[PDB]
Amino acid sequence: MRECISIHVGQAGVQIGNACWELYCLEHGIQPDGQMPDDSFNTFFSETGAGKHVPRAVFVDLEPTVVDEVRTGTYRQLFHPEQLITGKEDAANNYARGHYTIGKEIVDLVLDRIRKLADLCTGLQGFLIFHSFGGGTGSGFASLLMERLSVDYGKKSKLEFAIYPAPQVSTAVVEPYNSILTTHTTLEHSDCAFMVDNEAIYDICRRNLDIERPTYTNLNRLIGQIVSSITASLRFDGALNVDLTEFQTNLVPYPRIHFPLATYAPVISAEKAYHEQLSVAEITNACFEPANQMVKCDPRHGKYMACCMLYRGDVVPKDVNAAIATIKTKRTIQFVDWCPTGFKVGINYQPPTVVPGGDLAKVQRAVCMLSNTTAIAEAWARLDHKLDLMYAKRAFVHWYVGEGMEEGEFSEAREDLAALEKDYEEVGV
C-alpha cells in the first residue's frame, strides 16, 4: 500500500536499474532467483502465493543488446520474462526518431505493462523514471512515455533521475538538440527532476573513494544508494518519516523550478572509513561542500532556496539540530531572502546496506541531501550557448526534420528555455 513503480528507459536506465535492483534485493530478503532463504519488500516487490517475489519495474529499451544481458545473467530468474521490453532498432541519438517514428509502435506495450503493474497496486505513491538526456530513446521515448503517462494517470507524482549532459566531457555531438527538446516536455510532465552529472561522479570516485579507473558500474551504485535513501522511510520506521509527496511540498517552490540536486554524504572507502569518525557533525558538512556534489555547478555562485535532509542510522535529533545550526552560522553558504527556514529533516533508523564488491564501506550514518539552488541556471545558460552556437548554421537539423519533425520546434523550445533560464533571475533577487 506504499508501492513505487520504477521505469527504466534506455541504456543508462537499464544500467542504473541493474545496480538499483541488486541493492533492492540485498536490502530486503529477496534472493537473486526471487525466493526467500517483515513487510518492507512490498514497496518494490510483488507477491505470488508460491514464495516468488516479482519486482515492480519495467526495463524498456529499443536496442536489444542491453536488455538481453539482463535475461541471460544472474538476475534473469528474478524478472518476469515479459517485463523486459525490447525493440528492434534504436532511436540512433535522435529525439525525433524515438519520439515520432520508432517510439510510437513500442509505447502501447509499455503502457499496457504499466497498467498491469498498477493493477497490482492499491497504494501507489508514484513513479520513478530513470533516463538520460543525451541519448535518443532516453530523450525521445522517455518524453513520450511521461507525456502519455500524465494523460494515463493524471496528477500522480513522477520523479526524474536524469543524466544531464556534462559541461566539459560529452559522449555525443548532437546532444544539445536532444537536451533542448526534452526539457521543453519534461517541464509540464515531471513533478521533480533530480539531476546528476557524469564527470562530477568521476571526480568524487577519484578523490573520495580510492578507485582510480572507475567503470559505469561504480557510477550506478552511488545512484542506487541515493535512490534507496529517497524511499527508505516508506519501508522502514523512523523518528521522522518522509513521503514522496513530502518532498515536492518543501523542495519545489514554483512549478517551473523543479530541478534539485542530490548528495550522498559519507562516500568513503573501507580503508578510509577505518580512520574517520562519521558522526552527524562531520557528514553534514560534506553535503554542503561544493566539491562533493554530483552536478558540475558551483552553489557558491548561486543561493539555496530549499534543503531536504534525510538521515539514516543511529542519528539523534540532538546532533542534527546542533549541526544544521553550525551550517547556518557560516557565511560561505547563503540562502535567499524569501526563505528564512530553508531546511526539511528526515530520520530513518534503518542503516544503509552494503553491497559486496562495491567500493562503499559499512557505515552507521548516512544522509542524502536534496536541494535546489539558483546555481543550476549556469548549466541552462551553457547548454543554451551550445544550442544557439550550433543552431546558427543548422548543423544537424536534416537528421531531425526527415524523421517526423519541423523547423519551428527548435525555436519554440529554445525560447521556452529562455523563459526558464531567466525565470531563475527573478527568483534569486
Binding site: R414, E415, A418, A419, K422
Partner: peptide, 18 residues
Amino acid sequence: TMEKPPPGEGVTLWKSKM
C-alpha cells in the same frame, strides 16, 4: 512586440523581443 516589454498582457517570447 517591438523590442522591450510594452504595457499589455501577453506571452513573453524573450528571444524574438516580441
